[PDB]
Design a protein around this ligand. Sequence first.
Ligand SMILES: [Mg+2]
Ligand SMILES: [Mg+2]
Ligand SMILES: [Mg+2]
Ligand SMILES: [Mg+2]
Ligand SMILES: [Mg+2]
Ligand SMILES: [Mg+2]
Ligand SMILES: [Mg+2]
Ligand SMILES: [Mg+2]
Ligand SMILES: [Mg+2]
Ligand SMILES: [Mg+2]
Ligand SMILES: [Mg+2]
Ligand SMILES: [Mg+2]
Length: 156
Amino acid sequence: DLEERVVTINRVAKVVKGGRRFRFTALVVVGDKNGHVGFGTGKAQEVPDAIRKAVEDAKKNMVFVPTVDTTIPHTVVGHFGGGEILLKPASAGSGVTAGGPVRAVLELAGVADVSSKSLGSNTPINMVRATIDGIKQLKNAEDVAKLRGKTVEELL
RNA sequence: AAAGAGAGUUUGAUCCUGGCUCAGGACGAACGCUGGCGGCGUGCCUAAUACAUGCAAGUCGAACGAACGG
Ligand SMILES: [Mg+2]
Ligand SMILES: [Mg+2]
Ligand SMILES: [Mg+2]
Ligand SMILES: [Mg+2]
Ligand SMILES: [Mg+2]
Ligand SMILES: [Mg+2]
Ligand SMILES: [Mg+2]
Ligand SMILES: [Mg+2]
Ligand SMILES: [Mg+2]
Ligand SMILES: [Mg+2]
Ligand SMILES: [Mg+2]
Ligand SMILES: [Mg+2]
């Protein structure tokens, strides 16, 4: 059982001879607070039907976020097109400090204390892409030692 | 140890670039409506413009020649 959060609902149009036909596009972030999160996109003639398509789509982009002490292991920078996101660990109890669409991908992912800053564009779809582009770079300390052949206490 | 929030606006609809505007904090402040108290501070930013009237620099008879008091 996952949680839903509608980010943006936008009305788009294509021009056809007689006039204009309008459609609704919805962007939805889905995940459980344990560390899994994903996003999707839908399109329909009605707002309720656009969400349902986006929920099913979002269940195909699930990603895992590694966290230590309810905080990301280190500092990463996302990048996707014209949008980029800076994610930074923060002290316990500070809470999430994030912009509009980047809060959803962090509160749903279960991260409790993290600081961020959007250095790029403002488009909601490119902020979600640029954020997940940062979670990919995120590594745990346990796995780093495994690649480097060291042990955890030797690293730190 | 500390550690950074965005939004509106070009288009039939979109993505970028890009300016304009807004949400926060601070004044030796002024103006508008209203107005109980106590503590601690502050009060000519302009004409270094012109100034009534009072007071802000005196003291020593144990350094040297006086007036009340027989
Ligand atoms: Mg228009
Ligand atoms: Mg701008
Ligand atoms: Mg501030
Ligand atoms: Mg304000
Ligand atoms: Mg009164
Ligand atoms: Mg009054
Ligand atoms: Mg003066
Ligand atoms: Mg003069
Ligand atoms: Mg005089
Ligand atoms: Mg006097
Ligand atoms: Mg004498
Ligand atoms: Mg003497």
